[PDB]
Structure formats: structure tokens, C-alpha cells
Design a protein around this ligand. Structure first.
Ligand SMILES: Nc1ncnc2c1ncn2[C@@H]1O[C@H](COP(=O)(O)OP(=O)(O)OP(O)(O)=S)[C@@H](O)[C@H]1O
Lengths: 185, 148, 422, 211, 124, 69
């Protein structure tokens, strides 16, 4: 009982800190998705979102298994987010068009967040190409994106593999939030 | 003798002349041992005997070190000497909090520097043009960053 | 007869583009190749040309936002049909399914069906279809560029409307494969440093003179009310400064600079005072502590444990030590540079049990931390991701560079300079 | 002149539509008759046209690079030259670059006196005087290069025959993915000998193109 | 007309650049006895062939044009003009046959036609 | 509530199919469930190579020797 007590304590702590840091960071640039790194992340940490009526908050989770190439990542993600817009909504191209049509096709503006489940094993060239792809979505202004990196460890490992020109795209507003059951005990 | 505090200097310098050598992984140098340090002592002393001056001064150690370490454009040594003197000058002006330094101020700084250059005024006109060539060259180079 | 605009560094290109493109579909060639590397403003000079000449008609596509030629075709179809519906609201029309086309010939048939009905036009008119970055399509093949070149011929010659393409591409290693077609092309060379600074300042003064942080610090400091030029002066000065100080690091990019500027502008603002605004010199001499390092990084004492430290430090030993020597230098009685050779299991365990400080024979925590490693992708397998944990043909190799090896060695106090000898 | 340009095209290209592509702008660009007559009498516009057509195949690229890029390039070419297969890692390029910078500093008189006017604290000891860039930053220049195609992967099939083989090669879960950034053995596209012929000798690294 | 080919009567009509390319390739074939050359190696051989002749004003003109269409304003080309273009004009014409490597200095090149007929074509 | 609602047992957990890392991870996230009893066995002497601390945490393996030859 005391075990599960402290367990739920730490769990609610993690959910709270991530939900907090996910918002309130009004960065006047507003042309680059904000990134949230999870240092030492177990990659098993579930995430919740604000209900936030008048704007869908759709979570997207990508596994290193879901990522054979760029095209299939894009399609799987598009299908997932479209199914979620349907569940919130009650013929569509699995592509970027679904973004801008989104408003016309669902009314409320969109705000997605990507949760790369276990990044260290994904082939970083693919992920890089995918991020450069996503960058194009910033010409519609009815959507905003945010990234949730679940690095297993070693932020240096990540910044060793990506194209530096894309790091300089992520580095717009990052937050080195840690998620480690082992920290100062 | 080594009475000048170049002594201390020399010690530190030898350090890097070991560090720059990186045989394997912190494995001993091929080319340099402590005998080379004793050699630096002797080379210094010998340069002193050359200039006919006792009590080796750190600049001597510097020359001995660089001589021991080896293995448009105009006469290369002259250009690099211009570079060294001008950079020292600008560093001193930096430390002293002096206001600024202009190209013509530097050319007159050399006017100061090389008067035993001698020759003729024609030479001065020529050496002046050379100085301007060199300073604009550094500009075109990336040594000192310009302003305004 | 067309109004050629002016661009700060596209004079020749502006002229030749307005020369290869006009209203008359007859004197307008079929295709066109705006070539050049990313950072020359093709997507911008072309836009600033079209906005100067609105009488004509164009479509703008983003081949990078699409992925393959299938969505490419479908998007071309939908954009063309909508553009025509919105270009002549009067003519009745039957829209064809843009999601029906899946083959390059289906596209031609559909376009023919779309154009045959517009034969009520008063004159031959052009339609410039812009593909912005036909190179960067993630599934390019040798047989796509010509596939799109040839659509001019298949389409009827006397249609009231004339589709004319404008391709955009980079990596001249691609355009070379199609020289013999002799399609007219324009090249955009990358800029020199000075013109880079010019473009950058004239494009970002509007951002920096009126950004939030500087204007804030205006009232946040002694007011010292001044004219717009003072902010112009200081902004342009910072621009020349950052570019002349980071050029050698960034090259002749325009985007990388448009990132460094925004990463180093807020702090630079913070390091301004009441006086330096009329003195860029001391302003620089004060803010210096940033001008000399990218700070674009956002050796770690890896969380891993003792047994893991030794596992890793032993699995590194055959990045130079082939099994020919290990049983010699490790018995119980330079390839530091090159990519590491492949281990095999039970050799790792061998060297481990050797250099672990008879003390330990248990292997549950050992393999536990081994799997931990392999999840951290520090010692990855050349073979697949699922059968590695059998014992089929399978090789293991370290994916950590040598500096972290030095770190792990010193921290664990075991020395490694021995086992490497040359 | 026009005759000479025609002859040039004939000897090199021997292809009319090429010359046609050259003519189209020269004619269509003019605004008055006298200007066009001047042009066709001098055909100067053909010069700029040839140039721009030629602008950035392989030499213009080489010319539009700053100092540090050129240094990385030269040093990497030297490393490729040493090894037989030309295959050079990134680490090798960096090590050779570092020792080249060490050399450039070495041949500088390297005066570092310590004394000065009493309690002066002046007479600084600047000796390196070349900002040897770190491993952490060069990676930027390395990516810039590898995407400016001065380099290439060891053996990479550039563009397959058709979308069939291309798609069958995209399904290939590659393993060079798994090898880190600084081990992909890049082979060379511009060899050191040629490199010596283009870098203008004014550049302060020109004396390293030649070994 | 149902027997005679045209490859001979064709190659006697290619651009001087193409004939230069082919003749260099044949020199390489007999020099290395491998009937397989490397593309950049062929470029080196073309440089050879241009420079083995003296500084003759005519060799001067050749060097100039073949490296820059006059107009010293723009000059100093690495590989000869139209070289990509003539390479392709050969390759697609089935004469030359090349493998596919994006690295354009170690890619192989082979003649599909007989060496003999090519040599004869050079002899006219 | 906490009671076994199904008992699964794997013969040769190192099998040519179950050992596939995908199948292994699926069975891990499965064995996280409390109301199920997980009991299995292997033959591969290298069994511990299969599970990281994540998969062990999922499994909470308790070991027992059974040698009957
Ligand atoms: N002559 C110019 N005048 C003003 N702004 C310019 C000029 N040249 C480039 N720019 C700016 O630089 C940006 C680069 O535009 P792009 O065309 O996207 O660059 P690029 O070379 O096309 O690379 P891309 O986008 O991957 S195709 C433009 O959007 C402008 O903001």
C-alpha cells in the first residue's frame, strides 16, 4: 500500500510537470514547434493533454517499429490523427493536405503533439527527413505542433546524429526536462 | 645565464612541446625527451652568445623553441612579422582601455616601429603601401574583425 | 511585353526569367529548370517576379510536402481543376475525380478531359505550373524527370489553354543526368559573403528594429528617446558583426544565419546599456562573451553502472585487437580511427571475465546490463533487431567514440592505454 | 563574334537547339532596336549565358566556400590521398585538419614575452592565432559539404533505374544508419590534384593543396 | 542497306569533343589492357592529351574553348565543357555503357561496340 | 480485483518465434498484467541476454532450476 502510494505520487508528479511545461511558453516567434526532451526517459511514460475546447489536442506516438521510411511514418501518423479527429468529430488523403483542410473538415483549429516513443533506435536520417517535412506545415497558422522526445539517455547522442541545420530548428524553444526514477533518491 | 624569469617561462613552454606530441595515447614522444629540454637551454645560450648578450631573455627562449619545433603575398617572414607586431599592439591597446585604433594610426605605429629600416623616403612610400596591403590583407583574412 | 521586376542580386536571372516566360503561350517554351542550391531564394525571386506580373496565371506546388509521384499527380489534378474553376467562374464544368488518377497516363487523359471543355475561350492562354523543389522528392528515380518533361507532347497542341511547367531543382549532380534534353534552364549561384550580409540585413531589419525584446529594453532602460535610424544603425551593426564573425562556420547560408541571429539576439539585447547605443564598439567589447561560440548544442557521465562500465570497456577492446592477439595479451599466465571490426559473443564475456577486478562468475546482471546497452544503442548488432538474442550468425560492435571510452576508463580507474600498442 | 560563338557550339556541343536556347534570351531581352543590334554585333550576352549555365557545376561551388570549409575540404582530400581506396572517415579528416592547423601556427615566429613596464600586466602571450575549430562545430561544415556533393558515401547507388528498384532499395533497412556520423567512409568527388588547380593561390591554405 | 550498320558513319559525325573522348578512351584501353576505364581517369587522360602538345597557339585556342568558350571572364573549369552532355549523348546512344554510382570519379565505363571498328572510325 | 483469470505457460521461451524481439516485448507488456500468472521455461543457456531492466521490470522474473535430463 505504501509502495503504490509513493508510486502514484511520482506518477502524478510526472504527468503534472509535463502538462505544465507543455504550455504557457508563449514564444513570440510562433513559427517553430516547441520541443520537450525527456532525459533518461523510460519511454513508457504515458501522456495526457488538455481538453481545451474549440481546438483538438491530438496526441501522436511513433515507434521505431512504426518507422521503416519517411512515407510510411507520414501515412501512419496521418491515419492516427485522422481517426482521433473522427473520435472527437463523430475520403481524406493520408497526407499533409488533411492539415489545412482540417479546419474546413472539422471546424476547430488543430494542435498536435508528437511522441517518438523510443528515439535512440530510430534511424535518425529518417526522423530528420520527417521533421523537415513537418516544417512545411507551418504555413497554415490554424495548426500548431509540439514534439516530445523520449530519449533513453545522452542528449549528446541525439545532437550527434541529426543534421545541425535541423537542430538549429529544434533549438528554438526546448526544455531539458528529466524523467528518471533515480534522481537524488 | 638564465637569470631572467624566462626560466619559469621555459618550463611552461616545454610542457606544451610535450603536449603537442600525442604519440598513441599519452605514450612517450618519439622526437622529444628531457634531453630536448637541456637542448633548449643550450640553444638559448647559443643564441645569446650570438647576440653577444648575457642573461638570456624570454624572447631568446621563444626563438629557440620555434626553431626546435619545425620539421597578394610578399616575403613571407616580413608579412608574418607585421602580423605579430600589429597583433601585440592591438592587444596592448585592448588592455590599456585605449579608445580605438585606425588603419592610418597603425601605419604611423610602424613609422614608429621601423625607423632603422632606413633607405629612402621612396622606401617609406613603398613600405607604407606595403603596410596598407598587409592590413587590408588581414581584413580579407580572418585574424582581426573590423568595425564600422 | 512584360514588366521585369528588380531584385538585389538576381538581375541577370530576373531578366532571363522574364525572357523565357511571357503571356504568349507560343513563344513560351514547354519546361524550365530553376536550378541552384538551397539558400539562393529561388522560391523567393520567382514569387517576387510573379507578383509583379499578375495578368498571367500560375499554380504553386510544394513537392517536399508531398512524398511520391502518386500524390504529386493527384495534387496537380486537383490544383489545376480548382484553379480553372476559380479562373473562369462562368463556364459550366464537370469536375473530374482528382483522387481517380494513379498513373502518369491517367493524368494526361484527365487533363485532356478537363481542357476539351474549356474550348469556349477567347484566345490561347498559358498556365504556369510551378513545382517547387522537384529534386527533393523523397522517392526520386531516374525515370521521373522525363516522365514530367514529356507531358507537353501528349497533350493536344491546339487547346485553348497551354500547360507549361516550371521545375525547381538543386544538386547539379541531378540536372546533369538530363542535359541532352537541352530544356532551357537558369542557374542561381550561391552568394558571396558581402551580398549575403546585404540580403540578410535588408530582410531582417523589419524583424529586429521592432522585435519585442529591444523595444522593451528601450523603456526598461533609461529612455534616451531617439529616432528610428538609431535602431537601424544598431541592428545593422549587429548583423554585420554576427555574419562577419560566424561566416567561416556557417558558409554562405541564409537560413543558418537566420537561426544564429535569433539565437543570439535576445542575450545581445540583454547586454546593452544606456551608453553603448551610440557606441557599437564598447557594446561589442561588452557582449563579446557570445560572439565567439556557436552555443548551438542544447562525454556524459552515463547513468550506466560498474558491471556495465566494464562490459562496455571490454567490448571496445576489439576495435583494434583481433582474436589473434587477445589470448596472448590477456591470457591467464590506426584502427583507433577506422570503423570498428565486428565482435562475437562469448568473446566479450571472455575479455570481461578477464579484466573484471574468479571474483565474479554470475551472469544474470551481466546479460541484464548487456541488454541495457543494446537498448541504448552503444553496442549494436549488424544483424536484425529481433533474432540477435539467439545465437545465429550475429556480430556485435561498439557505437561509442573513443572520448567516452577515456571517460569511462578514468572514472572506473582502470587503464586502457596498455592494450593498444603500436 | 557571333560566328565564333557558333563555331564554339559546333566544336563542343554540335547541337542546334543548345544554341537556340542561347539565342532566345539575347533576342527577347532587348528593348530597342539599337540595343539588339549592338548585342548581336558583340554577342556579349552569350558570355554571361555560358557562365550562368556553367555557374555551379563543380568550380563555382568550390569558389563560393569560406575559409574553414576549404580547410576541411583540403585536409579531407589529403587523407583520401594517403589511403589507397580513398575512403576517409570524418575522424581522419579532423585529425589531419588539426595537425595542419598546428603546422600553420608552428611556422609563425611565436613570440610570447612575459615582461613589460613595471606592474604592466601587458605583453600578452598570444601564440596560436588561428581559431582551430572544435569537433563540436565542424560537424556543421561537414554536413554542408556532404550536401554540396563534394563528398559521397563509400559506394552509393545515386538514383536507381526506375521507381521499382528505387522502392525496393528504400525498403532496405540500411545499416550505415547504425554506424555513427563520424565513421561513414565518404569517398571523394574532387581529387587533390584538381583541387590544387582551382583554389586561388591567394588563399592562405594554398600551400597545402599540393602535398 | 539491310546489312550495313551506321555506328561508323555515325561516329564520323559526332562533336569533336566526343571524338576526343573516344580516342582518349581507346588510349586508356590499350595502355591498361583492361577495356574498362574509370571516368575521372578518362578526364585525366584528356588533360594529358591536351597538354602533351606544346603551348602552340592552336593548342592554346583548343585549351581555351574546350575549357571556356572564350570569354576569359569566366574560365578555369575542372572538367571539360559539355563533358556531362557529351557523355550522356554517348551513353544513351548505346555506344558507351556505364554503371550507376553517384560518385562520378570512380564509376566504370565500357565500349559496347568493338574496339576495332571504333579505331577505324577514328581513322576517318 | 486481483485473481488469476488465465494461466499461460510457454514451452521453450527461447523458441524460434517467441524469442523474436517483437513477440518478446508483446509478452512483456502482457506479463505486466497482475490477474495473469506467467510461467515459462527455456533451453538457450543465454536466456538473460533477452531482457533489459525494462523487460525485467515488466516480467519480475523469479528463477527456478529444474534439471531432470
Ligand atoms: N535577393 C533576395 N532578396 C531578398 N530576400 C532574399 C533574396 N535571396 C534570398 N532571400 C531570402 O532567402 C530566402 C531563401 O528562399 P528559398 O528560395 O527558400 O531558398 P532556397 O535556395 O530556395 O532553398 P529552398 O527553400 O530549400 S528551395 C527567401 O525566402 C528570402 O527570405
Amino acid at each position: 500500500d505504501q509502495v503504490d502510494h509513493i508510486i502514484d505520487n511520482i506518477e502524478a508528479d510526472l504527468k503534472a510537470e509535463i502538462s505544465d511545461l507543455l504550455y504557457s511558453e508563449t514564444t513570440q516567434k510562433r513559427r517553430c514547434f516547441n520541443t520537450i526532451f525527456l532525459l533518461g526517459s523510460d519511454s513508457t511514460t504515458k501522456i495526457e493533454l488538455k481538453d481545451e475546447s474549440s481546438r483538438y489536442n491530438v496526441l501522436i506516438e511513433l515507434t521505431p517499429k512504426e518507422s521503416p521510411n519517411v512515407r510510411m511514418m507520414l501515412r501512419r501518423s496521418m491515419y492516427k490523427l485522422y481517426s482521433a479527429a473522427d473520435a472527437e468529430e463523430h475520403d481524406v488523403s493520408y497526407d499533409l493536405s488533411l492539415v489545412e483542410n482540417f479546419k474546413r473538415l472539422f471546424g476547430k483549429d488543430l494542435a498536435m503533439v508528437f511522441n517518438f516513443k523510443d528515439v535512440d533506435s530510430i534511424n535518425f536520417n529518417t526522423l530528420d527527413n520527417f521533421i523537415i517535412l513537418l516544417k512545411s506545415a507551418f504555413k497554415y497558422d490554424h495548426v500548431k505542433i509540439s514534439l516530445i522526445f523520449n530519449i533513453n539517455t545522452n542528449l549528446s547522442n541525439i545532437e550527434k546524429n541529426l543534421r545541425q541545420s535541423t537542430i538549429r530548428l529544434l533549438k528554438r524553444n526546448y526544455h531539458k526536462l528529466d524523467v528518471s526514477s533515480n534522481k537524488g533518491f | 645565464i638564465l637569470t631572467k624569469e624566462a626560466r619559469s617561462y621555459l618550463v611552461e613552454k616545454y610542457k606544451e612541446l610535450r603536449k603537442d606530441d600525442a604519440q598513441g595515447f599519452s605514450r612517450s614522444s618519439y622526437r622529444i625527451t628531457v634531453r630536448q629540454l637541456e637542448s633548449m637551454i643550450r640553444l638559448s645560450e647559443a643564441i645569446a652568445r650570438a647576440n653577444c648578450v648575457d642573461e638570456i631573455t624570454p624572447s631568446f627562449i621563444a626563438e629557440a623553441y620555434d626553431l626546435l619545433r619545425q620539421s597578394t603575398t610578399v616575403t613571407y617572414d616580413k608579412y608574418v612579422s607585421m602580423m605579430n607586431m600589429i597583433v601585440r599592439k592591438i592587444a596592448e591597446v585592448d588592455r590599456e582601455g585605449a579608445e580605438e585604433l585606425t588603419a592610418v594610426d597603425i601605419v604611423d605605429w610602424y613609422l614608429l616601429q621601423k625607423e632603422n629600416d632606413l633607405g629612402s623616403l621612396a622606401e617609406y612610400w613603398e613600405e607604407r603601401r606595403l603596410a596598407f596591403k598587409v592590413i587590408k590583407r588581414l581584413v580579407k583574412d580572418r585574424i582581426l574583425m573590423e568595425i564600422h | 511585353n512584360v514588366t521585369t521586376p528588380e531584385v538585389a542580386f538576381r538581375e541577370y536571372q530576373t531578366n532571363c526569367l522574364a525572357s523565357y516566360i511571357s503571356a504568349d503561350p507560343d513563344i513560351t517554351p514547354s519546361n524550365l529548370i530553376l536550378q541552384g542550391y538551397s539558400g539562393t531564394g529561388k522560391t523567393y525571386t520567382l514569387k517576387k517576379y510573379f507578383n509583379a506580373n499578375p495578368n498571367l496565371h500560375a499554380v504553386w506546388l510544394e513537392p517536399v510536402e508531398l512524398v511520391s509521384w502518386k500524390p504529386l499527380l493527384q495534387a496537380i489534378a486537383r490544383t489545376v481543376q480548382y484553379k480553372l474553376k476559380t479562373l473562369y467562374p462562368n463556364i459550366p464544368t464537370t469536375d473530374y475525380d482528382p483522387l481517380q488518377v494513379e498513373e502518369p497516363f491517367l493524368l494526361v487523359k484527365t487533363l485532356h478531359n478537363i481542357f476539351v471543355q474549356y474550348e469556349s475561350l477567347q484566345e490561347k492562354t498559358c498556365l504556369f505550373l510551378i513545382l517547387d523543389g522537384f529534386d527533393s522528392l523523397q522517392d526520386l528515380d531516374a525515370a521521373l524527370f522525363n516522365k514530367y518533361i514529356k507531358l507537353n507532347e501528349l497533350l493536344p497542341k491546339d487547346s485553348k489553354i497551354n500547360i507549361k511547367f516550371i521545375y525547381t531543382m538543386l544538386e547539379t549532380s541531378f540536372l546533369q543526368r538530363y542535359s541532352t534534353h537541352c530544356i532551357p534552364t537558369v542557374m542561381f549561384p550561391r552568394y558571396n559573403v558581402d551580398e549575403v550580409s546585404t540580403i540578410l540585413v535588408m530582410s531582417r531589419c523589419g524583424e529586429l528594429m521592432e522585435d519585442s525584446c529591444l523595444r522593451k529594453r528601450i523603456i526598461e532602460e533609461q529612455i534616451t528617446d531617439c529616432t528610428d535610424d538609431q535602431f537601424q544603425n544598431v541592428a545593422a551593426n549587429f548583423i554585420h558583426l554576427i555574419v562577419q564573425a560566424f561566416h567561416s562556420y556557417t558558409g554562405n547560408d541564409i537560413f543558418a544565419l537566420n537561426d544564429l541571429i535569433d539565437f543570439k539576439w535576445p542575450k545581445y539585447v540583454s547586454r546593452i546599456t544606456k551608453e553603448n547605443i551610440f557606441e557599437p564598439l564598447a557594446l561589442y567589447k561588452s557582449a563579446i562573451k557570445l560572439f565567439l561560440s556557436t552555443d548551438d548544442n542544447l562525454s556524459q557521465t552515463y547513468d550506466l553502472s560498474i558491471i556495465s562500465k566494464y562490459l562496455l570497456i571490454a567490448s571496445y577492446i576489439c576495435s583494434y585487437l583481433e582474436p589473434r592477439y587477445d589470448a596472448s595479451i590477456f591470457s591467464r599466465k590506426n584502427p583507433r580511427y577506422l570503423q570498428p571490426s565486428l565482435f562475437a559473443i562469448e568473446r566479450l564475456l571472455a575479455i570481461f571475465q578477464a579484466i573484471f577486478p574468479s571474483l565474479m562468475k554470475a551472469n544474470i546482471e551481466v546479460f541484464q546490463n548487456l541488454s541495457e546497452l543494446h537498448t541504448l544503442k552503444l553496442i549494436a548488432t549488424t544483424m536484425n533487431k529481433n533474432i540477435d538474442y539467439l545465437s545465429p550468425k550475429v556480430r556485435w560492435k561498439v557505437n561509442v567514440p573513443w572520448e567516452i571510452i577515456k571517460e569511462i576508463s578514468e572514472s572506473v580507474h582502470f587503464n586502457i592505454s596498455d592494450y593498444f600498442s603500436d | 563574334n557571333l560566328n565564333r560563338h557558333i563555331r564554339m557550339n559546333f566544336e563542343t556541343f554540335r547541337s542546334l537547339p543548345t544554341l537556340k536556347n542561347s539565342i532566345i534570351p539575347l533576342v527577347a531581352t532587348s528593348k530597342n532596336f539599337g540595343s539588339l543590334c549592338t548585342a548581336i554585333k558583340s554577342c556579349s550576352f552569350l558570355d554571361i549565358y555560358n557562365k550562368n549555365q556553367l555557374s555551379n557545376n563543380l568550380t563555382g561551388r568550390l569558389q563560393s566556400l569560406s575559409d574553414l570549409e576549404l580547410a576541411i575540404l583540403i585536409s579531407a582530400a589529403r587523407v583520401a590521398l594517403r589511403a589507397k581506396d580513398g575512403s576517409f572517415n570524418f575522424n581522419l579528416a579532423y585529425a589531419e585538419y588539426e595537425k595542419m592547423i598546428k603546422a600553420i601556427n608552428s611556422r609563425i615566429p611565436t613570440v610570447a614575452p612575459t615582461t613589460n613596464v613595471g606592474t604592466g600586466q601587458s605583453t600578452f602571450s598570444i601564440d596560436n592565432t588561428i581559431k582551430l575549430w572544435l569537433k563540436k562545430d565542424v560537424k556543421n561544415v561537414w554536413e554542408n559539404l556532404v550536401q554540396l556533393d563534394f563528398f559521397t558515401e563509400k559506394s552509393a547507388v545515386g538514383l536507381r533505374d526506375n521507381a521499382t528498384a528505387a522502392f525496393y532499395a528504400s525498403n532496405y533497412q540500411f545499416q550505415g544508419t547504425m554506424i555513427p556520423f563520424d565513421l561513414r567512409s565518404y569517398q571523394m568527388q574532387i581529387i587533390l590534384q584538381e583541387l590544387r588547380r582551382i583554389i586561388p593561390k591567394s588563399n592562405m591554405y594554398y600551400s597545402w593543396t599540393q602535398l | 542497306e539491310t546489312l550495313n550498320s551506321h555506328v561508323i558513319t555515325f561516329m564520323t559525325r559526332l562533336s569533336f569533343t566526343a571524338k576526343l573522348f573516344i580516342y582518349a578512351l581507346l588510349n586508356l584501353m590499350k595502355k591498361n589492357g583492361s577495356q574498362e576505364q574509370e571516368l575521372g581517369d578518362i578526364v585525366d587522360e584528356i588533360k594529358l592529351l591536351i597538354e602533351v602538345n606544346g603551348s602552340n597557339k592552336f593548342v592554346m585556342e583548343i585549351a581555351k574553348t574546350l575549357f571556356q568558350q572564350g570569354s576569359d571572364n569566366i574560365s578555369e573549369q575542372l572538367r571539360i565543357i559539355s563533358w556531362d552532355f557529351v557523355l550522356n549523348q554517348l551513353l544513351d546512344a548505346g555506344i558507351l555503357f556505364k554503371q550507376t554510382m553517384k560518385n562520378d570519379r570512380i564509376c566504370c565505363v565500357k565500349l559496347n561496340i568493338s574496339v576495332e571498328e571504333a579505331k577505324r572510325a577514328m581513322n576517318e | 480485483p486481483l485473481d488469476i483469470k488465465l494461466i499461460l505457460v510457454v514451452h521453450n521461451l527461447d523458441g524460434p518465434s517467441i524469442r523474436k524481439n517483437t513477440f518478446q516485448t508483446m509478452l512483456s507488456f502482457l506479463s505486466v498484467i497482475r490477474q495473469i500468472a506467467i510461467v515459462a521455461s527455456t533451453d538457450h543457456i543465454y536466456a538473460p541476454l533477452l531482457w533489459d531492466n525494462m523487460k525485467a521490470q515488466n516480467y519480475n522474473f523469479v528463477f527456478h532450476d529444474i534439471s531432470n535430463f
